[PDB]
């Protein structure tokens, strides 16, 4: 039991970890990451090489600090609706219950988002027997706004299948493997829905978020440096709403700002430059008055994209609301 997270070192090494969603529950940091395994499945752009099967919840009392692995919180074998692939999760707390939101493919090989419930932030969690009605695609972030309303941000293109949901019904397994394939049109936007009071469903039809440049024009499909790929995250600073996300094939975490949960959000700049390994996935959390960026890389595995490790670093906002770009391997 030794302290970790002082010089951007891996927070845990006994398992591979990715896609960290960090929260402060009960005055502690709780982290909800994917648990990477060396499944030896084929590698490709639809992500079959990411064949995760369970979640472990991690916690820290301080940063740096000892990282507690609380064991298996949820196993894919116990989720009745799920076929494969437990991808980037998140958690929320309401009225003394804890909710784990997770993307997984159903038995028709279509990504949906499910919820599982516990009395403890560390789990374990009991999955609902079906996924959230009207959910689709991947990478949920459930954000509690200051007014007590909770919103799920979600979506991912390419293997996350968001490009196959243009009409509210799945376009089929022969549909686009990437995006709309119209680079001069506006890019695909992430999704948002207000959550129900009981946290098991959406309280409205799912909305799509507009992301625009500094001149107010939509980010285009061809603009891979700035357009949404996956890993939506929401935080607030100065009353401004910050939508951050991964750009996928250009390997950035970027951010965009707006004045309400639904946007539009105006692209501002880069949160995190590219890491070791193809994927880049993060969260941003305030703990004891300091802001932290949780992220991952493939450093521990010697550069294997599907065997990752989570890390943390301090994140600096300026008073005008801009954020200083982090480069992962400099200081
Ligand atoms: Ca996430
Ligand atoms: Na910048």
What secondary structure does DSSP assign to 134-146, as a single string? T--SS--EEEE-T
Ligand-binding annotation for 227, yes or no, is no
Cα–Cα distance, 143 to 23 (Å, whole number): 10
75 is catalytic: no
> Which ligand number lies closest to the CA of residue 316?
2
Q: CATH number of the domain that 331 lies in? A: 2.115.10.20
153 alpha carbon, distance to own chain's centre: 9
To which residue do tokens 């804890």 refer?
Answer: 98
To which residue do tokens 């609301």 refer?
Answer: 321
| C-beta atoms surrounding 38 within 10 Å | 12
Burial of 94 (0-12, 13-18, 19+ CB in 10 A): middle
Quick one: tokens of 86? Answer: 């437990």
Burial of 42 (0-12, 13-18, 19+ CB in 10 A): exposed
- Residue 135, CB-side half-sphere exposure with 13 Å CA sphere: 29
> Which ligand number lies closest to the CA of residue 294?
1
CA–centroid distance, residue 254 to ligand 2 (Å): 9
Torsion on CA atoms 309, 306, 101, 106, rounded to nearest 10: -170
Cα–Cα distance, 74 to 123 (Å, whole number): 8
List CB contacts of 317: < 8 A, sequence separation 6 or more. Answer: 237, 291, 323, 324
Ligand-binding annotation for 160, yes or no, is yes
CA–centroid distance, residue 252 to ligand 2 (Å): 11
Cα distances (angstroms) measured from residue 188 to each of 47, 93, 180, 191: 19, 30, 7, 10
To which residue do tokens 């196993």 refer?
Answer: 75
Closest CA to 70 of 96, 100, 94, 50: 100
Give the strand pairing for 82-84 and 97-106. Answer: antiparallel
Cα–Cα distance, 331 to 323 (Å, whole number): 17
Cα–Cα distance, 309 to 301 (Å, whole number): 8
Cα–Cα distance, 323 to 133 (Å, whole number): 36
Burial of 180 (0-12, 13-18, 19+ CB in 10 A): middle
Computed from CA positions of residues 169, 174, 179, 183, in that sequence, does the dihedral angle turn out positive or negative? negative
Closest CA to 264 of 226, 207, 221: 207
- For residue 250, the SS3 value is helix
Cα–Cα distance, 240 to 229 (Å, whole number): 22
- Residue 98, CB-side half-sphere exposure with 13 Å CA sphere: 20
Ligand-binding annotation for 281, yes or no, is yes
Cα–Cα distance, 83 to 328 (Å, whole number): 35
- Could you tell me the residue range of the domain that residue 316 belongs to? 1-331
Cα–Cα distance, 27 to 58 (Å, whole number): 14
Ligand-binding annotation for 84, yes or no, is no
| C-beta atoms surrounding 160 within 10 Å | 24
> Which ligand number lies closest to the CA of residue 254?
2
- Residue 23, CB-side half-sphere exposure with 13 Å CA sphere: 24
List CB contacts of 172: < 8 A, sequence separation 6 or more. Answer: 164
Cα distances (angstroms) measured from residue 85 to each of 113, 167, 243: 12, 24, 25
Active-site position among 19, 51, 90, 179: 19
Our count of domains for the chain comes to 1
- For residue 77, the SS3 value is helix
| C-beta atoms surrounding 17 within 10 Å | 26
Cα–Cα distance, 101 to 56 (Å, whole number): 13
Closest CA to 91 of 134, 55, 44, 51: 55
Ligand-binding annotation for 159, yes or no, is yes
Cα–Cα distance, 180 to 159 (Å, whole number): 14
Ligand-binding annotation for 88, yes or no, is yes
Cα–Cα distance, 201 to 17 (Å, whole number): 28
> Which ligand number lies closest to the CA of residue 324?
2
CA–centroid distance, residue 19 to ligand 2 (Å): 22
Cα distances (angstroms) measured from residue 312 to each of 31, 157, 251, 282: 11, 26, 18, 9
Widest CA span of the chain, in angstroms? 53
CA–centroid distance, residue 215 to ligand 2 (Å): 17
CA–centroid distance, residue 21 to ligand 1 (Å): 6
Q: Sheet of 141-144: strands edge to edge?
A: 141-144, 150-154, 191-194, 207-208
Q: What is the CA radius of gyration of the chain?
A: 18
- Residue 11, CB-side half-sphere exposure with 13 Å CA sphere: 34
Cα–Cα distance, 159 to 139 (Å, whole number): 11
CA–centroid distance, residue 31 to ligand 2 (Å): 26
Helix extents (H) in 130-189? none
108 is catalytic: no
List CB contacts of 148: < 8 A, sequence separation 6 or more. Answer: none
Identify the bridge partners of residue 103 per DSSP, sorted by sequence position: 113
* DSSP assigned state of 42: P
Q: Sheet of 283-287: strands edge to edge?
A: 283-287, 290-297, 309-314
Cα–Cα distance, 147 to 195 (Å, whole number): 13
Ligand-binding annotation for 14, yes or no, is no
Identify the bridge partners of residue 270 per DSSP, sorted by sequence position: 254
Query: Do 23 and 39 touch, CB atoms closer than 8 A?
Result: no
Ligand-binding annotation for 302, yes or no, is no
Active-site position among 36, 51, 230, 297: 230
Cα distances (angstroms) measured from residue 230 to each of 7, 33, 244: 27, 15, 10
CA–centroid distance, residue 244 to ligand 2 (Å): 13
Cα–Cα distance, 142 to 91 (Å, whole number): 7
CA–centroid distance, residue 67 to ligand 2 (Å): 31
> Which ligand number lies closest to the CA of residue 272?
2
* DSSP assigned state of 197: T
């Amino acid at each position: 039991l030794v302290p970790r997270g002082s010089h951007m070192e891996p927070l845990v090494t006994h398992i591979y970890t990715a896609d960290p969603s960090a929260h402060v529950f009960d005055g502690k940091v709780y982290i909800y990451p994917s648990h990477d395994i060396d499944a030896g499945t084929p590698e490709n752009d639809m992500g079959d090489h990411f064949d995760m099967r369970d979640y472990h919840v991690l916690s820290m009392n301080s940063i740096p600090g000892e990282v507690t692995d609380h064991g298996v919180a949820l196993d894919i074998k116990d989720i009745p609706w799920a076929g494969r692939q437990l991808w980037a999760p998140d958690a929320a707390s309401k009225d003394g219950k804890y909710y784990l939101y997770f993307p997984a493919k159903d038995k028709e090989d279509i990504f949906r988002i499910g919820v599982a419930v516990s009395d403890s932030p560390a789990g374990p969690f009991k999955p609902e027997s079906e996924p959230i009605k009207g959910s689709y695609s991947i990478d949920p972030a459930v954000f509690k706004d200051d007014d007590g309303k909770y919103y799920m941000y979600f979506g991912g293109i390419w293997g996350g299948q968001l490009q196959r949901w243009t009409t509210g019904e799945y376009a089929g397994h022969d549909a686009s493997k990437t995006d709309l394939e119209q680079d001069d049109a506006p890019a695909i936007g992430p999704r948002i829905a207000l959550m129900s009071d009981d946290m098991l469903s959406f309280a409205e039809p799912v909305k799509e978020i507009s992301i625009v440049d500094e001149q107010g024009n939509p980010i285009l499909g061809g603009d891979h440096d700035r357009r949404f790929f996956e890993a939506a995250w929401m935080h607030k600073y100065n009353g401004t709403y910050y939508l951050s996300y991964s750009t996928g094939d250009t390997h950035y975490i970027v951010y965009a700002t707006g004045d309400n949960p639904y946007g539009p959000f105006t692209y501002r700049g880069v949160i995190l430059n590219p890491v070791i390994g193809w994927t880049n996935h993060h969260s941003i959390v305030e703990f004891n008055g300091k802001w932290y960026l949780f992220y991952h890389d493939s450093s521990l595995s010697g550069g294997k994209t599907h065997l990752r490790c989570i890390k943390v670093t301090e994140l600096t906002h300026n008073a005008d609301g801009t954020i200083e770009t982090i480069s992962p391997y400099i200081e």
